[PDB]
Symmetry: D5
Subunit: 174 residues, 10 copies
């Protein structure tokens, strides 16, 4: 209908808004991370009944991203004051105690609309993974459906495979 | 741009979706309440830092509505699994322990868009009160801004003033 | 169809025209009241059979508004020479003897069209209350239907609740 | 912009609404007068400061119209409850005590818009006279401006001149 | 369809073309009469079978217009060489011998189209009277149908009533 | 702009209206002459200063057309009551005493608009000659300008040349 | 559909292209003849079976045009190399031996499209005669159909009648 | 701009009109040749100065086409009466004496417009060759420019190569 | 611009065309695999210089897909006769000797246009992975860029995670 | 739908992209060959089962083009890495060993779309030959269908026939 979303060859549309960094409502922009890579985790709903092992398995692996010159930016289309209550609720309660990831909140749904991972009649974002390299170009579009989950072992395989490639031109010999 | 919103003379657009009734995700429709009146409380954000005295003061006064043949239907543009976590969190924590109101969730934002109480760039609903009489006609549009609050003493004054009037024709002599 | 009306978050459209101030046809503009707040009372018809207790109960309470840095601006879509005949007709006749409120007249119906409180096929304005703060931003949209009435005790509660809030930032702690 | 107004050769658009007949709010339609002629008096404002000799001089001459098979239908774009207060206010006060004319009220301004006698930015109707013969065809368009007045001696000359002509074909020999 | 015609509140569209002044084809424009008033007599057809008492009764009364600072401008949608043959044909033959009025000819029908007095399928102008005051504003729209006639006693009453009013402001006290 | 006018290969648009036949206002249609040919003489103005030798030279030659199975239909965009006054005015006065041609009058200018011989800003028809054969097909378009004239010797040469040809197929051997 | 063709009051559209002058393919433009008049002879087809007496009767009369300050410009929608073969073929063979007329060729059919004498589905030009005076204004539109022919005695009568008139103003007294 | 022309994979648009078959104006249609193949020779101009060896070299080779189940259909955008004069003019004069090919004439230029071989501003067809197989599908589009020529040795090579192929499926093994 | 591509919640657009199954050009449709799942591997170019370990690592793992009720359908926007030459060329030459995957060919580029993995100015498909479940709903959109590669260990993790989930409702408890 | 393709009279649209020159992926543009002529060979598919005698018969005849100041530019809508594998595969295998022609690759299909030789639903180019002279003007459009082939003996006949003609003006005398 418009916008054109975000392609895997062209530049990713920018994202901004309040976010939860280290337990606080701090404004987070895409331009704050220029020079690194950024990895978005759209995940649909807040406080969901599923023990959220998918999102925790990137806060537990956040040390693996600073080795690879990147910052994961988790994101959902729920209220930012609701994400702060979901970081602050302790685990074994459907909680995210001390999550070391900027959990964005596109409660405007202006951004998950842009990335094309929004179910419009449901308002929730499809479980999407988006790697933007430091040029500002979106480079990897992993969009799952709702019931399946993402993986950290593939989001580190592919994310390592760009910087091994883009240093060495654009061809991998082996 | 379209829709036309909901007027105070014409029929209110219908609302539906998952909701929190008595601590459970139960589907709630406008057609389930035909014959009663319905009073919507748009309130912007979930788990907000303000001690939510505005919304609690209708669950504490829910007995005054069954005397007046009506059901209040609180509503916000946040996730329904986030409202369930906000009813379940106990009070003096920014909580709503045992709220006897169907707390809707228009996380699609298809309905607060219709009622014209949505701030589009913020995604949150303006603090709006909407009385629809049993014909399906919207009859009272109280829309505050964000920082001020609603009142139960006016939402019972006006809501009593319809049924005292619509029984006695359409004119009040005193 | 156009105009877009007046929202509760955006700036209110201006109003102007002849009005009844202290029993005289004096031109009254929104820009004459910049710095104060303004409270509009749309009321549908002139010389109506109902003893107009709704409108009188703001002229009797006009001292409560100069304490709160605001001027109520009553308004109807009837002729300004008809409002002057309705202020001049004495009470217990359906009259408004010595009303200390600028009673506007949008007999063009260009303004109650803008505020969205006009019934187009009837020409009369819905019983609407509109609080614009001194920035020019509409901040409270109370629109009743015809047979019910407004209240002075809520239009002083909400109007006090802005200036207590907007002095103290935008959050109320209690 | 649309409508096309009412021409002097084509059929006049119908008029309806509440009106003041003999001091009462009675519904008056054009179809109630089929077979007679109808003579409209648009006059701009209600309770105007001018001693309304223009409108009174047709209630004083209403016997001259039942001799000529016609009913004058005075009309203004003011509220019908305001016309009832203007018939009920006695003369030498800017009043119309016992006016034997159906004083219409197009407070919707849907009809004086159709007849093209409405000043849109002022909302008031130009001082217009409209003779529709019993076929439903508008036949005489006298539209003055505001400060000048109409006449009963011409609105009886022309109105007699139709029925003397339309009985005798369409040509007057002398 | 366009043009918008000429209203009774707005400025009248200009008229020009060849005309019969004192028995000669002389060009006559609206701008030649600025400062006076102008009174148009649309009359439908030339050399009509009716003894044209309507048009003669303004040439016989042309002295009454120079007392009132105005020039009547008779006009028809027939050829200007046909009007000259109709002034030159003597009376008791359907003639207008020595008519002291500029008889215009809008044989283009560009002007009676503008004034809205043209029957398009017949090409003839409705019997219309139009008073434009010296500002260029059309101020009186008397449009009869074909078989009835105009009057000089009303076109002098109304035309005197402007200049008595516009000298004395815009209100007539008696 | 529309209509498409009348071509010399396609069918001529029909013409109708009041006309002067033998000194009387009789309705004349194209369908009244089906089976004959018809020859139109558009001529611009009525009662023109030129001694109208162009039009008279077809009434003087009207016997030559009944030999050739055709009826000339003279036509102008002036009033039909003006043509009757121009047939009735005697010659050596710019007259047409006893003209044996149906002198049409398209005072609507709906037909000379169709044939494309109308000067729109002047309202007068170009001096046009139009031969329609009995199929209803326009077959000859002679359109002069204003100051030059037509001819009877060519309008009989060409008009004879159709029926000599259309009897003998469509080719002339000599 | 567009273009607007060439009228008899407005300026004629220009014509250009290769032509046959004195047996040679020479470029001929309208601007080469400015100051003279130009007379076009559209004729439909080349090498037609009819002994082309219509076109020859202007080459035989070409001396009569240099007396009248004009150049006839014959024209057809056939190839210019086909016109050269039709001038070069001798007479009594359907030929035009030594034709002293610039025989144009609008084989583009861009010009007979402009003059409105083209039968589009047949591609051939209607037998048209067009007199443009030296101002560039088309002044005479004689368009026959196919089987009938033009005349030199009328194309000299009318062409003399312009210059006798346009020297002596625009009116012919006799 | 429209039409879409004729492609080399899709069906060729039909062609019709008068043509020269064996020295006579006989109507020739595409549907008369259904079951054979058809080979069009657009050639630009008639009676051109070039000794037309290109077109003659298919009438001299017309026996080679009846061996290959096809009829060449030469075609030009000149008049059909001009082609008949060009077949009838003897050779060593730029002639085509006894040409055994149906020489079409699209003097309407409706068909060379369809095939896309028309130079619109020149009206002449580009030297085009078009092989339509018996299904009605255009199968070979050889379009030269003007000064170069076609060939019979390639228009027999390709035309043999279809029927050798379409008999043996659609693949040629050697 | 249109199409709308293929979403991760809605139904995937169908794909068809010639393909390489077991070394032969066999037609392969989406409807041939209804009941299974289908996994597409868009890969950009044929015979690329990179030793194509990405595509081989699904033919080597094709036994793991028949255990999971699915058929991988590799696809590229190159010619199907070029894929057959790339399966037939042996390995250590940039070859795919005995690839047990239907290698599609959307050389029309109508399908990789639909799935949104086509670089339009380059014509090559982005390295995309697409899991459609047996309802026909696209369920997983992994789109890499060109230089990085896909993985079989994630395309088996996610593909197992649907059927473990869709058997057990839509929620995974652990 | 747009583009307009490439005509045989107008300028050919430019072509660019990677190509196979002497066994290497070298960028080839139309502007690199300005001053020569260029001859394109669209051929549909790569590695086709037909022993490609059509394309080889221009690499075997490439010496005949440098005598005629031209460079053939073979082109197909297949991948450029697939053409390199098709030059490198030796003959009697469907190969093109040591082809001395720049084999272009419009794998974008932006150029065979422009030249109008693309079958859109098949993606393959029709077997087309295109001679552009050194002005940049397309001058010869030979488009065969798929199963038939081109010829070198005609693509040297026509290509010699331009430069013999364009040196000697534009007419060939013999």
């Amino acid at each position: 209908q418009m916008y054109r979303t975000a392609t895997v060859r062209e530049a990713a549309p920018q994202f901004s808004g309040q976010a939860v960094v280290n337990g606080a409502i701090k404004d987070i922009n895409m331009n704050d991370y220029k020079g690194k890579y950024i990895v978005l985790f759209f995940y649909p709903m807040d406080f969901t009944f599923v023990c959220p092992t998918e999102i925790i398995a990137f806060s537990d692996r956040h040390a693996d991203f600073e080795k690879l010159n990147t910052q994961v930016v988790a994101v959902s289309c729920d209220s930012v004051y609701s994400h702060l209550a979901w970081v602050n609720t302790p685990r074994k309660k459907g909680g995210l105690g001390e999550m070391h990831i900027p959990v964005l909140a596109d409660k405007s749904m202006e951004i998950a609309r842009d990335y094309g991972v929004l179910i419009e009649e449901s308002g929730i974002a499809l479980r999407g993974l988006f790697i933007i390299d430091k040029k500002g170009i979106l480079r990897h579009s992993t969009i799952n459906d709702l019931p399946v989950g993402r993986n950290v072992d593939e989001a580190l395989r592919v994310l390592e495979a760009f910087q091994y490639a883009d240093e060495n031109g654009d061809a991998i010999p082996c």
